[PDB]
Design a protein around this ligand. Structure first.
Ligand SMILES: [Cl-]
Ligand SMILES: [Cl-]
Lengths: 209, 6, 209, 6
């Protein structure tokens, strides 16, 4: 209950205009809205690959409990790479409701992903573009969404990686995708301080406009 | 992979 | 450091109008502005009584490194009672520069205190008024100062205790006073989340006016 | 005590 208190306070301070009785915020991963090769633990914050990992389509995604409400203005979550597992084919991003979960985020239409093995961004296309560094065990990857201008940038270990996507649809869900055994990542939807100084970013952006 | 194709 | 990163963010968040280049905020206890019976440890956040507790006046106070700047609007710090020691003659409050430190806060002119053994508030007088509960080992006592209307309330374990003082002078220093051996208390000047929801209180007050 | 004077 002290965890829940800190979460509540952080959501309130980052998203002052959001009334969760109207738009609940994503606070964990959805046990229903995930592929079968995904397992959850640690109050549904920890994600692990539990497929045998030798099919032609091993990829598996999970969406958070709720889409990001526009009233956030700017939204932020971070994912810690607990374990890169076998190959570290891990994607972090966003997807609309109902998008195929037997995939890494960004492969399908209305899905957006930044993958750790190649550092590429994936924007509704199975073919990535060079975007950022690779990432692996120990790294923290952040995903910042601007609901006002429909753009998204990622961060690595506290550092912005520049805009990755524009023309984002509304009502996107935080999403992670894993593909190989041993892959384990943790979501911070606000339960903990962020590595990236998101408050400072939000301050500067509201200044810039 | 991270590519759709292998 | 990670401790100092969290401190900086919390000060920026609670006191957005404060430019510490103009008015540095109190961040620890002063090693120079204390009575000899006070010892400091843990980056000058931990206070312990180190006099022999058998003299006519054993009372000993310490002031933070800086006074509270007006640009805070509302200022908050919390003190955790690690050990009540022998008698738990511990006072928490505020005092002006140069006030005598062979005292508990509030006994002297321009000094304000809330004492754990009797629950009593002390407003520039050696005789207290009934104000709040006693406090002891394990409790967290907060002191909220309003630089706009010059009033102060205390909190215990997250609960407001109502206004204790009015007509506060400017440039007051957070102050702790101890009197008997074994007394140990820790300041939180922002290094850690507060038990009291100070952000919510600040939000409620700025709407109320 | 907490009083300035016993
Ligand atoms: Cl925060
Ligand atoms: Cl805070």
């Amino acid at each position: 209950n002290e965890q829940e208190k800190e979460l509540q306070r952080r959501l309130k301070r980052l998203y002052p205009a959001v009334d969760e009785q109207e738009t609940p915020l994503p606070r964990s991963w959805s046990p229903k809205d995930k592929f079968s090769y995904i397992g959850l633990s640690q109050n549904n914050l920890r994600v692990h690959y539990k497929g045998h990992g030798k099919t032609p389509k091993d990829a598996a995604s999970v969406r958070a409990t709720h889409p990001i409400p526009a009233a956030c203005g700017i939204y932020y979550f971070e994912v810690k790479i607990v374990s890169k597992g076998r190959d570290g084919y891990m994607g972090i991003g966003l997807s609309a409701q109902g998008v195929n979960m037997n995939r890494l985020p960004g492969w399908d239409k209305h899905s957006y992903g930044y993958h750790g093995d190649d550092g590429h961004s994936f924007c509704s296309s199975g073919t990535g573009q060079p975007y950022g560094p690779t990432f692996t065990t120990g790294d923290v990857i952040g995903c910042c969404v601007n609901l006002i201008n429909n753009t998204c940038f990622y961060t690595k270990n506290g550092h912005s990686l520049g805009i990755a996507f524009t023309d984002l649809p509304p009502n996107l869900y935080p999403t992670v995708g894993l593909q190989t055994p041993g892959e384990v990542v943790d979501a911070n939807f606000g339960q903990h301080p962020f590595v990236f100084d998101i408050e400072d970013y939000m301050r500067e952006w509201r200044t810039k406009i | 992979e991270s590519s759709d194709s292998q």
